[PDB]
Amino acid sequence: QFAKPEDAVKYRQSALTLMASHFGRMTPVVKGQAPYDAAQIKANVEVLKTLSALPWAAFGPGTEGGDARPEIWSDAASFKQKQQAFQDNIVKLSAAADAGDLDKLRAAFGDVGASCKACHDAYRKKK
Amino acid sequence: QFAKPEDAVKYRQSALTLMASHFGRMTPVVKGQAPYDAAQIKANVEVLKTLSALPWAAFGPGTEGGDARPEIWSDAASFKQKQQAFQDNIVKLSAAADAGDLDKLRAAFGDVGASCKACHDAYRKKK
Numbered sequence: 001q002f003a004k005p006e007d008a009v010k011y012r013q014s015a016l017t018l019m020a021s022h023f024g025r026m027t028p029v030v031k032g033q034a035p036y037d038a039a040q041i042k043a044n045v046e047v048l049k050t051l052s053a054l055p056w057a058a059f060g061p062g063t064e065g066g067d068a069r070p071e072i073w074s075d076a077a078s079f080k081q082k083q084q085a086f087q088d089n090i091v092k093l094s095a096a097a098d099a100g101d102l103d104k105l106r107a108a109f110g111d112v113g114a115s116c117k118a119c120h121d122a123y124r125k126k127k
Numbered sequence: 128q129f130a131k132p133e134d135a136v137k138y139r140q141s142a143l144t145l146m147a148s149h150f151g152r153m154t155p156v157v158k159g160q161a162p163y164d165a166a167q168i169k170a171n172v173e174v175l176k177t178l179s180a181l182p183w184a185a186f187g188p189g190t191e192g193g194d195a196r197p198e199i200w201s202d203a204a205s206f207k208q209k210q211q212a213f214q215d216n217i218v219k220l221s222a223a224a225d226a227g228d229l230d231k232l233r234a235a236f237g238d239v240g241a242s243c244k245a246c247h248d249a250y251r252k253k254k
């Protein structure tokens with residue numbers, strides 16, 4: 001769906017921005033600094049699940065650019081493993097949210113965050 | 128979820144960028160320039176439905192900025208009508224996509240596009 005590589009870059013950056021907001025906005029809830037409404041969090045994690053599937057199709061071959069490291073494309077299998085593993089961490093978060101289980105939500109939230117970082121460490125350039 | 132107005136602006140701009148891609152990428156299909164796979168389009172319109180609910184919460188009071196016109200906030204009811212009407216145009220598109228009905232999809236697509244423009248005409252500043 002992208003006319004030029006720049007369009008893929010803009011898409012993925014926008015998708016990742018939205019994911020970051022839907023993930024990060026739960027930090028106060030996880031920490032107990034904001035109240036835990038199970039229905040609110042269930043709905044939010046549903047949005048996050050949808051968003052978390054979107055960036056990867058915008059790293060198609062030849063869409064080098066932005067702050068993407070070239071290693072994304074020189075080992076396609078390894079990058080795919082990282083995004084699929086991340087999406088499975090989101091599945092654990094979804095299961096916790098759907099169950100209304102705050103303890104599971106906290107644990108899953110931590111693992112999701114670690115998975116964001118694991119990918120950045122291998123595949124995102126320094127600012 | 129926004130620390131400053133700038134954060135709301137970045138969010139809504141990213142959400143609208145993603146909506147524009149999920150909408151616009153169907154243009155060749157509507158026009159018959161690309162093939163019509165009912166399952167592909169059903170899935171895509173599902174993503175669009177989710178995305179099309181997201182921008183409006185990022186136009187909270189006091190989040191003037193970007194290319195948003197101030198009229199968004201001086202008549203809250205009218206802006207709400209436009210976004211709710213737009214989301215109902217997306218509902219027609221969803222129903223068409225879910226039915227696998229290309230004729231309904233074309234018609235709904237046109238009405239959705241008109242609704243994007245109707246809002247821009249009232250509420251988006253010139254570049």
Ligand code: HEC
Pocket residue numbers: 009012013014016017019020023065066067068069079082083086112113115116117119120123124125
């Ligand atoms: C690879 C499997 C990734 C996972 C998992 C996550 N991110 Fe990441 N992110 C990745 C790359 C390669 C990039 C650079 C994209 C580019 O082309 O520039 C990023 C970037 C971000 C950004 C910046 C977006 C922007 O506005 O330019 C944010 C805010 C971001 N990523 C956040 C984020 C969070 C919170 C994640 C887990 C919930 C996460 N990312 C996962 C690669 C990957």
Ligand code: HEC
Pocket residue numbers: 136139140141143144146147150192193194195196206209210213239240242243244246247250251252
């Ligand atoms: C109000 C009810 C709107 C509807 C319906 C749509 N859009 Fe719009 N859009 C609106 C505003 C007020 C703005 C400016 C936001 C800001 O603060 O700057 C926009 C902007 C866009 C953009 C630019 C995003 C960016 O990267 O900065 C795009 C690409 C965009 N809008 C596309 C778009 C499409 C295709 C729509 C229907 C499917 C659509 N918008 C609806 C307000 C409204």
